[PDB]
Amino acid sequence: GLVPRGSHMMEILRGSPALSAFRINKLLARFQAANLQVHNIYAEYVHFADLNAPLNDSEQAQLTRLLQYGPALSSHTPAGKLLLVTPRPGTISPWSSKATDIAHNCGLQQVDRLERGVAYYIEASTLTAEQWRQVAAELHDRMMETVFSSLTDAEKLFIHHQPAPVSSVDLLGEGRQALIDANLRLGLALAEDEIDYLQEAFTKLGRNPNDIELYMFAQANSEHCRHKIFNADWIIDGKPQPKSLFKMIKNTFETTPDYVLSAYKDNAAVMEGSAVGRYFADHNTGRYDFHQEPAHILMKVETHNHPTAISPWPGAATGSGGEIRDEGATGRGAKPKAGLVGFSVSNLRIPGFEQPWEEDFGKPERIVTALDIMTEGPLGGAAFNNEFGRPALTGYFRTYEEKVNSHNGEELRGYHKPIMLAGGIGNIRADHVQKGEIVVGAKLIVLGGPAMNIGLDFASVQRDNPEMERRCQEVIDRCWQLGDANPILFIHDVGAGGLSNAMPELVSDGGRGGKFELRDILSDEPGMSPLEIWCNESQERYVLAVAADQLPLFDELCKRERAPYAVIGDATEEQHLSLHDNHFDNQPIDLPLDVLLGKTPKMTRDVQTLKAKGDALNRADITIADAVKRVLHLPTVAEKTFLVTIGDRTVTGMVARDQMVGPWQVPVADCAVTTASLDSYYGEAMSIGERAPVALLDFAASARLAVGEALTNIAATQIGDIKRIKLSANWMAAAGHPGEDAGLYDAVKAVGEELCPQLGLTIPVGKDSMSMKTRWQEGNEQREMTSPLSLVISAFARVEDVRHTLTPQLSTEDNALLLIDLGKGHNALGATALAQVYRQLGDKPADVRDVAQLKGFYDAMQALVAARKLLAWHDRSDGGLLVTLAEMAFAGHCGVQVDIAALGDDHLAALFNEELGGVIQVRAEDRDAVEALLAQYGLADCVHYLGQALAGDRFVITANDQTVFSESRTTLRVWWAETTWQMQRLRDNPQCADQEHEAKANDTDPGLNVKLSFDINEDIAAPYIATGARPKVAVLREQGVNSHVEMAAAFHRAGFDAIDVHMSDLLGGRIGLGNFHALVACGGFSYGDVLGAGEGWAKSILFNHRVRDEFETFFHRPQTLALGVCNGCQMMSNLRELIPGSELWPRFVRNHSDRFEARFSLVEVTQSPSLLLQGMVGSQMPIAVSHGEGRVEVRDDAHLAALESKGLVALRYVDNFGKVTETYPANPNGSPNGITAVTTENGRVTIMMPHPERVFRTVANSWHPENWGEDSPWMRIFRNARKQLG
């Protein structure tokens, strides 16, 4: 391709088949059911290259080779109608940014931009023009993509547009009527008092406002930005209120300032951590050292509700992406550690799996369904968390949509506009918690990706480029790692409002002003107006202030990490903001700072209280037996595997407690626990409390239950003082809707003035979304879908001992199951899982019955966690005591024999109430002392003995001589799994979804088990470490690598001197491989896996003659070792032509499941010449798996038979039974003969997909036997490396 494109050339290069077997079969099945007779369909990826200069033969062959990737699926000769799906014109895709990155790092600077599209070849025959639009409609996303009829039509994606001029609003010429026209035209949605201020301010300044100044003002004075509702004065029932909603949340800090370092001063909150060894690479030596200093914990939770309703993937991705920015931009620089994902939607209504409570109430044409949000949403959120490298450790998922009789009578209550919750923790240094002072003349920089026209359904469609944020994070990292030499004076994140809010906020919080230059900002689309360059909500951008003489240091750091930066302005003494344009010689902005932060009348909400009545439960169709079946089928209660395994849970190697529990990997962990470092047992803990449907009956109860559930979910961890637990209050409501407003005040008062100050719980952070409703026309009537007052409390805490955390995993040993019913026998059935499941709302809901007992409960729980008196713990949340005992039996793979006689005469209420508390398991001999301890905290009238956990499959609930409920634990396990099975069927490979489900039906599954061939505690590297001689290992990384710090910590424990070797360090000629005898290619998402996972990394070595030679000399040397875990396994398997004895090596392509697999799979060490696996052969241990492209692919059977004969296989996936299996998920990728590790003939180079570096510590394993020391068996790989070098 060299078809006419201005001064540039557009090149058409073919690619591999885009869709695999089942995807094509699903498309054909989707066409049939729409009366579109399509015989066959074939999809093919096709690349488009915009070249600025010419391309020679060597360079042409190099471009063709970069674009050869993915699964080697059989290609078809194009036949039928061509339908090309490319992104919408004027839009650059995340693929395009990352693929072009590779071209530039491979020496092909002639390439301006690289875009991909999917060519569909439809053999349908005889379809009217209408039916063709229907076919095209099913092949693209109307919000992001467009359909073309020719491959040459893709020229529209690269059009050069002339920079648009600044428009002026003629206030001085047309009057106030010019601002009324601008408020309508530009879409500023300002109030009357706001337009009044804008009239006066510009009459004072005596000039016409530019469209840019007006748009900036709108973004700065929107309700969300200024937090109008939260700062507003209130009048409840004709009675004026003393405090505001924000001031009531601040009361929790005034009554409990304990352990808080920063609150309401940043875009996150900081609390006290522990003095642990912070591990990183020294700025001078390049060596990774342990820095013994206080590692303080930071936290923040965000929402991105409306964007998720329009486009799920971007809404969820940028939701976690903006939150990751809030964390990194805390103080003078911080580092994100772990994260939490949350969701609330309407009824799923899965085709062929409709539930008895689900009814179609319609939905706006403009928004997407609850099911589409649950397919594409979790994937987008996980895509960011996976590609950036932060583990998604805990969370919630709730479904609600019903014609309920609430506060405003009978109406539809649900979430058509969902709650997309994204949050997490991070670590920060003590001298970086506080924001530094901005000096006059401080250079104001924009760290991050080149802007595009994103924030202006269409304008609600976002963009996620997570590798860009990794690079940005690595710059923030090198900065706080410099100690007191940290260049960053002040750092703020970019988000709502774009640069128009971020910059005037950076200087304002510093007390300074600022002079900018529009042409110094990095732009990816030239045609933008000054309005668009400054007000666009483009992602992965940060704003920062750095001293003038610290600029050469910032440049050196950014270029080495490949993170784009641009100095756009200077900080000024005078409180004034100004933007300059060098292209037009004018000044787009010229305003005093107060003119922007300009106030008008403070909001006053004079509201009335409304209260629901709601009748008692109609128990006609309710039988305890059907109630159990119906409850376990409610998405809120049901297994959450489809939300857990799609997101990384093992990165940083600091993960102690992930969602998956026990040998059976059941996702029932109540909270998430991470270790503070890689050298301690101190840590962080995360939990979520939320009970939104209760706000339909009692507003104050739902709020209190959210604080209560967060506390009960956190209770199994060794925290100590309750004042150590810090809360985050995210409020979701529909402000204006009858009764919600007055009910928001009572809910904020209930937690802010009453419950939290009484327990000692601080709320140092929060956020608000105040328009949770959707309106549309159904027939001729208007329908509304209003959300309940949804409070999502996220509890954060410092851990004293990571090892002492309890899980729902029951022990079959002599035991006693004791229930702590904090509900005091109230047994409330209103607004429960049971009620919803039977299309009802109920009578009276659950609540914190006694404040002193909820505190007493926690203190008692802590007393038992420290004294090691508990065997297991699980709290009562959704679906009551039944679901708690069921989920405990699922995790323990055992039986339960309980008696609920002393729990009232109402058995349905005793089993299904969502009151606080739960079930603790103790040793039989310890029953008396534990009851006595629980009595010391005044909980004797709450503690009821239930029964015991028995070995078996029987789940029995009795009441004296009578049998209340008896069923097979496996039947309940499978029923509870049915929702995730169905979600994986429509999203992943149905073959894989079915195999995962059908393995749960086998009660004979022994779970993950261990077989060891060597001594796990024998440190064979000890005589070597004792000499003091520490050999150096090149811990290799490319832009987008995240699993390198723990890889360095693994070799360090073995006795190595781990050094940070970036690819830029080799390409820039700073570091050479000659001084090394050991190299390790690390894991991550280099280039966001674009152009094939690990292919861009390998080709930047291969095409660069100097670096290519540097690597070949390394592998060809007699005494060198090399490791390639994940990503780096994919990189090294693409470097075959450089490594000796790697002729028979396979490739690692997309998983058979077509999904990212974050598993804890069981492998076995097979006989291979591998020098890193010596002494380990025959062993069977669980390993950390986190990959989406790890399937071993051979060219034919000759390649596989030859690989097996040469004996190059090191690790194979085995099921829990012990045999080599190709069944999912025991084998997560679908690799032939279970391969995930191969080696060379000499055995010096070994590549593997699993992560031994993320699990080198026993506490870092999701499951491990209760006798294992500090080291896991995987610590031997690194020690074998030390003994081999001598």
Ligand SMILES: Nc1ncnc2c1ncn2[C@@H]1O[C@H](COP(=O)(O)OP(=O)(O)O)[C@@H](O)[C@H]1O
């Ligand atoms: N959206 C999500 N993303 C990741 N994990 C989730 C999500 N939703 C739920 N989980 C996990 O599934 C498990 C059970 O969830 P759930 O029963 O709703 O929590 P709870 O224990 O408070 O009742 C937990 O381990 C939780 O962290």
Ligand SMILES: [Mg+2]
């Ligand atoms: Mg919950």
Ligand SMILES: [Mg+2]
């Ligand atoms: Mg729970």
Ligand SMILES: [Mg+2]
């Ligand atoms: Mg639950």
